[PDB]
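User: Predict the complex.
Assistant: Input components as received:
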Amino acid sequence: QRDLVSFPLSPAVRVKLVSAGFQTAEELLEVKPSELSKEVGISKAEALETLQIIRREKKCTALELLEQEHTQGFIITFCSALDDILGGGVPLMKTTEICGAPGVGKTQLCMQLAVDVQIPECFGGVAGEAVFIDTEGSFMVDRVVDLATACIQHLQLIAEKHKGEEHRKALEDFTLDNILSHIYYFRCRDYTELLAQVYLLPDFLSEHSKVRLVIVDGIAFPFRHDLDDLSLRTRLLNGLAQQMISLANNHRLAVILTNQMTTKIDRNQALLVPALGESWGHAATIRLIFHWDRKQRLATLYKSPSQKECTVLFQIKPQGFRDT
Amino acid sequence: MGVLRVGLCPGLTEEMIQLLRSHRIKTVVDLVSADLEEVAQKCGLSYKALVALRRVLLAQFSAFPVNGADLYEELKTSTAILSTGIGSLDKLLDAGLYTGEVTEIVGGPGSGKTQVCLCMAANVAHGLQQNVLYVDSNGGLTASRLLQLLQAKTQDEEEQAEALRRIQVVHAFDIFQMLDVLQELRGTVAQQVTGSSGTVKVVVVDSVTAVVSPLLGGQQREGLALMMQLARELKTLARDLGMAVVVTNHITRDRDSGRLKPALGRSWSFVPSTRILLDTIEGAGASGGRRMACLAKSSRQPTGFQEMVDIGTWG
Amino acid sequence: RSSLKEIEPNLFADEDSPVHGDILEFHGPEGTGKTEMLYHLTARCILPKSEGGLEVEVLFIDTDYHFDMLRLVTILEHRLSQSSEEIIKYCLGRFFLVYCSSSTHLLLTLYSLESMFCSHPSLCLLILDSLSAFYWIDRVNGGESVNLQESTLRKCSQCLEKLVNDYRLVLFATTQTIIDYRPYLCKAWQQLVKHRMFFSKQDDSQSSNQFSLVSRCLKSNSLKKHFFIIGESGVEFC
Ligand SMILES: Nc1ncnc2c1ncn2[C@@H]1O[C@H](COP(=O)(O)OP(=O)(O)OP(=O)(O)O)[C@@H](O)[C@H]1O
Ligand SMILES: Nc1ncnc2c1ncn2[C@@H]1O[C@H](COP(=O)(O)OP(=O)(O)O)[C@@H](O)[C@H]1O
Ligand SMILES: [Mg+2]
């Protein structure tokens, strides 16, 4: 017994079918479409499309999942302590969200992750691509060039120190122009454009199967202005989160999202909390917050299903995201 | 009933269905609602064959009520007791968890719902040696945490390797995918009535809110129907096939007008059988694995009892 | 048969007279003592005269699949003054149960169980739990037209009223929530009820046993309030 409500049927065909008095697909499977159309007053096209959509609609256990996640590596951050606290870097097949006060280094982290995703597997990278979707216009090519130059300098240094021929073999292809051609750029100035780009993502990822990272630098800005109806915003945010997690699990990606902080006057001493309400709080697999403390930037893990929350210091150098 | 098929009931022919659908009476519901005398003499059909057909049609479509005592002795052995690692709910649940009920946990961000699900699944798979099916909808599962939890109870590689392969995981991100997965599970277990091993006894849904939350909103009505259908099929699965089903959920408005309440509105409140409201402590002793567990609805024992559960030092 | 004063002084004494047939329904939110109240009513009235009950038979129809054997057995054991292990099986062997999955299934079971009725006359109470569990499904399935909705529900209503008036039975039912209530079913159900009451409970922690009830008696328009206390051994009244 399978109720017809559990199928992606059009409301009209569903309502006329249940008005006829059918409540199981097991007997719709063998009914000839001619008398089917005659009985419920429909044509052949809707009958055949209903039949195919009904008939159209794997067995992986924990061991296979463990093996698969061990096969694919982690995205390096060039911050050793941040890699240690996160289990080895940014995990794949999961949605990661970063919050923080303005001018704290979220865009620098996004740029570094875009650069770091192209490290060859021999050195310990993932060797993939990157997709950058900008909603604020804060993507400057000069900073990316500087970060890539610093990364290639460090990579050459460590390769020379290792003194291994296989390391040299994976460097001539690792040139500035090649790595900087593997970052695909978009720009959505409105939340509708961002949603449309999100709907268009799966085909783009089907075309380019080497992509292993998707960055959406700023999701609060499109949704925090000119939107009086809160329910519509909540529905859009929930749908976007579901689509992003579906994309991450289907294409083996690492979704990176950026958020904003908002002052909350609790008790009498105001403190900063992430924006977009409380329902959005558990829409991301991992949540990270960047503090300021006293002239010292701290990266504190907030929510994760793998590691306990702690605190790690960091700072930004003219070479990019670094530790110490 | 749909169109006439051979084998549905004895003594069926095309003349019968032709005359009945000419008389504006085809389905079983209006045929039995209409008087048997009316169709018998008004249409002139034979009374004996008509009454025999009606009785054999009802009998093969009905559920005959049974006595209570006998089913009680059979349920004495059909049921089972599942322990997770803490007895706070165990004492307040007639000294044992119920296999065949819909229990659920409501908790906010970082509460520990999936941690409870993970530890319970590990305990069920390893200690009691049965297959378990886990359904994830937001990527909340990591196999490293399962391995770490298993290592806290065993130190042998073979046991860890064997335990993992009996935990089946499937990804469903839309309500149609979840419905298809559950229907496939129902069909497979119906086909596996002969077998005695390999049948999953515990079914866990990581998050039922996230899947159905986009479907709500507006002034329409299809989302409520979809969630009610999902609840009905979950209840039928758990009752008929004797499985323990555990789902999670979120909380709603905490303002002055509305107390801390489970999500999905009022209609979802009637669905589950047991509610556990995880919470975090404030002030001294915060952070870490210190979480306050409470029993909101049990419908079997007095409620409103608060306890302590540690996860950081547990497993 | 139709007597409601022998062992019902606490709740249902001074409102009725020995008559032919009646219909009762229950309303209120979740966790209000509904199923516990039905458990009390059925356990108090499933014993023979010598053991304190009425030596009557009750049929159970379940729709929410929330019926629990262990709670009923425990409440029976903790109520029996002569509590023993060998006679509880015989005391509970006068119980009939059936499970329902859909409104069509409910109607088909209703039109099938007449052979059961004619089998035994000892049946004296009929409980239908949560007839409100099939609202949204067919409400959206039937379509925009109101007639296409609750059609099977109207047929079920007429079948139930016929089966309760003709056979001298008593009916109990439970309804969910959507001035203290809202018109939920079709109009065919409002006339059936002989006494309607609402279930309520506040959020006081130290009085988790506290419960409240308010009833409407349309045949007399009498406003009556009742108070009861939940307990492990049963439902206490004061
Ligand atoms: N809505 C939710 N969806 C998924 N997981 C949730 C949800 N709400 C809470 N959690 C879980 O609650 C847990 C509580 O955080 P906590 O840091 O204690 O866990 P942890 O990383 O497993 O800890 P530890 O490794 O020390 O045992 C999180 O790990 C998170 O997975
Ligand atoms: N070329 C550079 N050399 C050194 N520090 C830099 C350089 N470019 C940017 N920074 C520092 O990195 C920080 C970047 O913050 P930003 O990513 O803009 O935060 P947000 O994304 O929240 O606006 C700035 O505070 C700036 O001081
Ligand atoms: Mg920025």
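The CA atoms of residues 70 and 76 of chain B lie 10 Å apart.
Let me know if you want any component modeled separately.
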